């Protein structure tokens, strides 16, 4: 059907360090749908490839989904979210005195350990997310209608999806190739933005054990 999906989001999201693929989001949504039906005790890797998406086969194995990484049209200047992880030293001292916490150590350490006060700064963008793919319009729309947030750090409320629209587009108009592609991919599909890296082309894109020599663009 060769369609393009765009997403607008009320909350800003984490700016993705690597490529936010549409097939990754659809795989996580299908995994959540399978958890809704088949209970929480499922293998997520059984259903994360059960997508309304065509599959491109490289000449030597190495199939990828026909989706693309989300391109960002920035509505806002890029800002930075400071966040901290601090275990409450006062509450831990009270629990250690009362014996609810069984800690023999008398001194905390903010440099490292359980009481490491840690600071970390993640980039923030509010934008329009455009992804080009090859898939059935009806299947994607239901998955993205079950989608509430996009991007990372969704436990702290970031990147709440205000809405989305899924619309057909011409065959030469959409590049779905802006995507983590294998090294033996078709040179028609490979543009100047695609470069060699150690990256996942599929599935769990964070799984460093699944990273391959890939031709991927830059977010």
């Amino acid at each position: 059907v060769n369609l393009k999906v765009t997403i607008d989001l009320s909350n800003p999201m984490m700016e993705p360090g690597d490529l936010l693929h549409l097939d990754a989001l659809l795989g996580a949504l299908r995994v959540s749908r399978a958890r809704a039906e088949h209970g929480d005790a499922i293998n997520p890797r059984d259903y994360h490839y059960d997508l309304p998406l065509e599959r491109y086969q490289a000449p030597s194995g190495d199939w990828v989904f026909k989706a693309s990484a989300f391109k960002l049209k920035r509505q806002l200047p890029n800002q930075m979210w400071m966040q901290t992880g601090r275990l409450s030293i006062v509450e831990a001292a009270r629990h250690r005195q009362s014996g609810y916490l069984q800690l023999r150590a008398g001194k905390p350490n903010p440099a490292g350990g359980p009481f490491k006060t840690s600071i970390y700064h993640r980039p923030i963008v509010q934008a329009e997310l455009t992804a080009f793919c090859v898939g059935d319009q009806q299947g994607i729309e239901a998955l993205l209608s079950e989608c509430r947030q996009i991007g990372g750090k969704r436990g702290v409320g970031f990147g709440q999806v205000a809405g989305f629209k899924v619309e057909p587009v011409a065959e030469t108009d959409c590049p779905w190739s802006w995507r983590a592609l294998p090294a033996d991919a078709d040179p028609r599909l490979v543009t100047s933005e695609h470069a060699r890296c150690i990256a996942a082309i599929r599935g769990p894109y964070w799984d460093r054990t699944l990273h391959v020599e890939a031709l991927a663009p830059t977010p």
Binding site: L76, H95, P114, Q126, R148
Partner: protein, 329 residues
């Protein structure tokens, strides 16, 4: 499952921000160099998109409490008010890993990756507290999203959506509050004032002479011991305004919703985002819409009885060994 918590800050809100911010004696924030500037620590603000007065959207400064802060506040009020009293009632104790997992989501019990079977992932995700946040060595994804505390304000209108145009504040929601640290040795005035001090007058005069020596040293330096005289500023969010707070449970059990409901019941003692010595962050809960159904009364929550009963059967069935096997193995 969606929970909307509408709160009203009784005291100012101050979620401190990083960066070197400065302010003059007048309220000019970040003055250009070549003038007397003072250290300022502002509230947590992010730029958000808003369309007020025009169809297009512009980046406006919205002063919020982060979702990480409210997430840890929900976690800590469930621990302080439901989880730890129940565990003390059964007489159960927590280890270092179970405490750093339950109270901070930290993986310091097993820093090395801990493998969890999909079945035990399901059972711990069905736990009333563990499935809400996850964390620990397993890094379980929680059932719970805790959004940022958004002020009901025209800047937040894209985040708020419809249904909040009434009681919507406008303009600046912040104020620079000035705080100084007096040197109490300078306020010593009599022998009876100073005779609680070892040495008394001689030690007091030694402090005075050390302070004047440091002042002359700083004056000659301008043309590293810091004294107790300080004068600084902190931007707060003004009291009395209204905030929304989104808590979405991703396919929960009834006991997890009951635990969040017990948190909202006992949360009136807690404080939002710190500023602890100045009593900052004290609030009252004005409304709780449970999937859009208003459930908050003045005395806690009336109704929602299946969640309260499920969390009751959870907390009489709650022991620490679930937390130990969630942390260690």
């Amino acid at each position: 499952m969606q929970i909307e918590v509408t709160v009203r800050n009784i005291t100012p809100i101050f979620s401190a921000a990083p960066g070197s911010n400065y302010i003059t004696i007048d309220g000019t924030i970040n003055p250009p160099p070549g003038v007397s500037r003072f250290p300022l620590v502002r509230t947590r603000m992010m730029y958000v998109a808003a369309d007020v007065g025009d169809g297009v959207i512009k980046s406006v400064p919205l002063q919020i409490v982060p979702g990480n802060t409210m997430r840890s506040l929900l976690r800590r009020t469930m621990l302080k008010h439901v989880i730890e009293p129940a565990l003390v009632e059964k007489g159960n104790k927590l280890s270092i890993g179970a405490y750093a997992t339950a109270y901070s989501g930290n993986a310091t019990g097993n820093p090395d990756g801990v493998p969890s079977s999909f079945d035990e992932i399901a059972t711990m995700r069905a736990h009333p507290f563990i499935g809400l946040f996850g964390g620990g060595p397993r890094m379980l994804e929680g059932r719970l999203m805790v959004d940022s505390l958004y002020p009901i304000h025209t800047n937040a209108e894209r985040i708020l959506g419809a249904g909040y145009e009434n009681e919507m504040m406008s303009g600046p929601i912040t104020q620079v509050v000035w705080a100084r640290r007096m040197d109490p040795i300078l306020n010593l005035g009599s022998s009876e004032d100073v005779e609680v001090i070892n040495g008394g007058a001689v030690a007091a005069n030694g402090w005075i002479q050390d302070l004047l020596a440091n002042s002359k040293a700083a004056a000659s330096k301008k043309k590293n011991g810091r004294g107790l005289k300080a004068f600084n500023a902190h931007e707060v969010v003004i009291p009395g305004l209204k905030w929304v707070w989104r808590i979405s449970l991703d396919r929960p059990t009834d006991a997890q919703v009951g635990l969040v409901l017990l948190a909202l019941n006992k949360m009136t003692n807690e404080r939002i985002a710190g500023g602890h010595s100045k009593d900052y962050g004290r609030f009252v809960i004005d409304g709780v819409s449970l999937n859009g159904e208003q459930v908050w009364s003045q005395s806690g929550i009336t109704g929602g009885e299946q969640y309260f009963d499920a969390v009751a059967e959870a907390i009489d069935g709650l022991s620490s060994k679930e937390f130990e096997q969630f942390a260690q193995s």
